[model samples]
Target: CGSKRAWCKEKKDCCCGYNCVYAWYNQQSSCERKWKYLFTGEC
Candidate 1:
């Protein structure tokens, strides 16, 4: 698959893949929140 940036709930790690990452921040069903970085690749 292609490169993806996501969220991690337990460790609070961002810019992760599908397996490690929890869910999409935009989705209502997502567990994690408080997402930022609406610009380029720099978080």
Candidate 2:
């Protein structure tokens, strides 16, 4: 919410409230998931 670091809602691949960086690259499920909200932005 404050910076580039943000948390996205748990979608098909992502765990809820996880940092965008981790969700985007670390999680296999997140990588496969297709959605824009998955990418965190300004809160």
Candidate 3:
């Protein structure tokens, strides 16, 4: 069970704008850095 900016075991739990990326063993971190922006408001 993961939320935005929270620790996730996998991508399935990342949910919504958040995504479980390749941080540590596929954890939820550093994704924003790769995306170049937080998924708040953008086309």
Instruction: State in Å the error of residue 38, model 1.
Output: 11
Cα RMSD, model 1: 8.5
Q: TM-score for every candidate vs. truth?
A: 0.17, 0.16, 0.37
lDDT by residue (tens digit), candidate 3, 1-43 = 4455566565545545556655766644532222335445221
Q: Clash number for model 1?
A: 0
Clashing pairs counted in every model: 0, 0, 0
lDDT for predicted candidate 2 compared with the true structure: 0.34
Q: 26 in model 1: Cα distance from truth in Å?
A: 18
Give the alpha carbon lDDT tens digit for every residue of 1-43 in model 1: 2123433444323433222334455642222223353323233
List the candidates ranked by TM-score, beginning with the highest: 3, 1, 2
Candidate 3: 10-residue stretch with minimal lDDT: 27-36
**Candidate number with greatest TM-score:** 3
Error of 1 at 11 (Å): 13
Model 3 lDDT at residue 11: 53
- Model 3 TM: 0.37
Q: After superposition, how far is residue 42 of candidate 3 from its true place, in Å?
A: 18
